[PDB]
């Protein structure tokens, strides 16, 4: 019994959401940004993918010249990182 070689880390909902709470503290967050909805969209995925989402979100902001990032940038990033939905 047990994964004696392939050790894949998997944090809880709050645990993984904290990763976004942390890595978002450098970019201008909007007046009512919802990160809860974002973490709920990421099943299985580890913190490495979450860091990718944080980066890709800023990319989505820059193309629309957004100085303050919204939830849209993050969820669009999630869809771009996991690449499940087409």
Curated annotation (Swiss-Prot):
Top-level taxon in the UniProt lineage: Eukaryota
Location(s) in or outside the cell: Cytoplasm; Nucleus
Assembly mode: Component of the 19S proteasome regulatory particle complex. The 26S proteasome consists of a 20S core particle (CP) and two 19S regulatory subunits (RP). The regulatory particle is made of a lid composed of 9 subunits, a base containing 6 ATPases including PSMC5 and few additional components. Component of a complex with USP49 and RUVBL1. Interacts with PRPF19. Interacts with TRIM5. Interacts with NDC80. Interacts with PAAF1. Interacts, in vitro, with the thyroid hormone receptor (in a thyroid hormone T3-dependent manner) and with retinoid X receptor (RXR). Interacts with ERCC6.
Similarity field: Belongs to the AAA ATPase family.
Task performed by this protein: Component of the 26S proteasome, a multiprotein complex involved in the ATP-dependent degradation of ubiquitinated proteins. This complex plays a key role in the maintenance of protein homeostasis by removing misfolded or damaged proteins, which could impair cellular functions, and by removing proteins whose functions are no longer required. Therefore, the proteasome participates in numerous cellular processes, including cell cycle progression, apoptosis, or DNA damage repair.
Protein name: 26S proteasome regulatory subunit 8
Organism: Homo sapiens
Top-level taxonomy: Eukaryota, Metazoa, Chordata, Craniata, Vertebrata
Full protein stretch here: 320 to 395 of 406
């Amino acid at each position: 019994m047990g994964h004696h070689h392939h050790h894949h880390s998997h944090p809880n909902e709050e645990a993984r959401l904290d990763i976004l709470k942390i890595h978002s503290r450098k970019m201008n967050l909007t007046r009512g940004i919802n990160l809860r909805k974002i973490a709920e969209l990421m099943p299985g995925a580890s913190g490495a993918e979450v860091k990718g989402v944080c980066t890709e979100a800023g990319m989505y902001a820059l193309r629309e010249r957004r100085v303050h990032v919204t939830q849209e940038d993050f969820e669009m990033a999630v869809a771009k990182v996991m690449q499940k939905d087409s």
